[PDB]
């Protein structure tokens, strides 16, 4: 059983996508996860976009787990450098029908008063009390406190290509981040057992957030645009 989808661009009112909070699709085909007014990003914004249909990552009848691959391009533009850009974006896997959690350093995927499991790959731009030097790529399992982290230099306003691959036989989640204009390549990988953290069916998508009001800084913002996205999953069981 295989499932796959591809988005060369994003059309307004895409029946295949589920938009939440501030997420919006521009007229120029970009998925803007967080609020951008008159070409300027704002703080206190959170937005998510999930693939409309649930995907089965494992089967309890056979115990088999899915292998998958996803590729996407994103762009993070940071207009106001001085204070500190925030917060970042993530590709994530969670139980179906979840609601946007806390914004800010929680990217909109963590809800303290009713936590739901999740596996996420973050592109963190703001250093929270629990983070190492930013920006960094991180593998998150149920917590925004990454199991593994790798720093990277952002191509401000530039395009970044990401490849996330999960091999069930080895339980390896490997991610590649490339900035074609800079010729830089970043890599990180960790062992993650999906069967141990997630339910059989899940939702895959993105979530991003800009500076939270509590920070008292309106400049703590940036764009979190997804330009294209393909997904392929294979469940033998």
Ligand X SMILES: *[C@@H]1O[C@H](CO)[C@@H](O)[C@H](O[C@@H]2O[C@@H](C)[C@@H](O)[C@@H](O)[C@@H]2O)[C@H]1NC(C)=O
Ligand Y SMILES: *[C@@H]1O[C@H](CO)[C@@H](O[C@@H]2O[C@H](CO)[C@@H](O)[C@H](O)[C@H]2NC(C)=O)[C@H](O[C@@H]2O[C@@H](C)[C@@H](O)[C@@H](O)[C@@H]2O)[C@H]1NC(C)=O
Which positions from 123 through 142 interact with Mn ion, judged by CB under 5 A? Answer: 124, 131, 138
Asked if 40 is part of the footprint of ligand X (rule: CB under 6 A), the reply reads no
Among 75, 78, 207, 219, indicate the residue that binds ligand Y (CB under 6 A). Answer: 219
Q: Which two tokens stand for residue 182?
A: 């800079």
Neighbours of 133 (CB within 10 A): 9
- Closest to ligand Y by CB, 44 or 146: 44
* Residues 114-173 interacting with ligand Y (rule: CB under 6 A): none
> Helix and strand tally (H, E) in the chain?
1, 18
User: Which of the residues 195 through 214 are near ligand X (CB under 6 A)?
Assistant: 213
The values of phi and psi at residue 202, to 5°, are -145, 175
CA-closest candidate to residue 100, choices 191, 10, 228, 203: 203
- Asked if residue 105 lies in contact with residue 96, where contact means CB atoms within 8 angstroms, the answer is no
194 in Cβ contact with 56 (< 8 Å): no
With H, G, I as helix, E, B as strand and everything else as coil, classify residue 162: strand
Which CB, 3 or 176, lies closer to a second copy?
A: 176
Q: Which positions touch Ca ion (CB under 5 A)? A: 105, 124, 126, 128, 131
By CB under 6 A, tell whether 99 contacts ligand Y. no
Residues 85-124 that bind Mn ion (CB under 5 A): 124
Pick what 105 binds: ligand X, Ca ion, Mn ion, none; C-beta below 5 to 8 Å, kind-dependent.
Ca ion
**Chain centre distance of CA 221:** 17
Instruction: Write out the residues near a second copy by the rule CB under 8 A.
Output: 71, 148, 161, 163, 165, 167, 170, 172, 174, 176, 178, 180, 183, 185, 187, 189-191
């Amino acid at each position: 059983k295989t499932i796959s989808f591809n988005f060369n661009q994003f059309h307004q009112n895409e029946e295949q996508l589920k938009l939440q909070r501030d997420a919006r699709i521009s007229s120029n085909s970009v998925l803007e996860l967080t609020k951008v007014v008159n070409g300027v990003p704002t703080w206190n914004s959170t937005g998510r976009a999930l693939y409309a249909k649930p995907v089965q990552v494992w089967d309890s009848t056979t115990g088999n787990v899915a292998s998958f691959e996803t590729r996407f391009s994103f762009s993070i533009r940071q207009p106001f450098p001085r204070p500190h850009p925030a917060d970042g974006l993530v590709f994530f896997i969670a139980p179906p029908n979840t609601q946007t959690g806390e914004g800010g350093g929680y990217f909109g995927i963590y809800n303290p008063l009713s936590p739901y499991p999740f596996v996420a790959v973050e592109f963190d731009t703001f250093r929270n009390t629990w983070d190492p030097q930013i920006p960094h790529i991180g593998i998150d399992v149920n917590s925004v406190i990454s199991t593994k982290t790798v720093p990277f230099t952002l191509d401000n306003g530039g395009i970044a290509n990401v490849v996330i691959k999960y091999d069930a036989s080895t339980k390896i989640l490997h991610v590649v981040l490339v900035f074609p204009s800079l010729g830089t390549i970043y890599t990180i990988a960790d062992i993650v057992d999906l069967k141990q953290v997630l339910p059989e069916s899940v939702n895959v998508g993105f979530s991003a957030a800009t500076g939270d009001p509590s920070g008292k800084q309106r400049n703590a913002t940036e764009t979190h645009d997804i330009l294209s996205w393909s997904f392929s999953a294979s469940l033998p069981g």
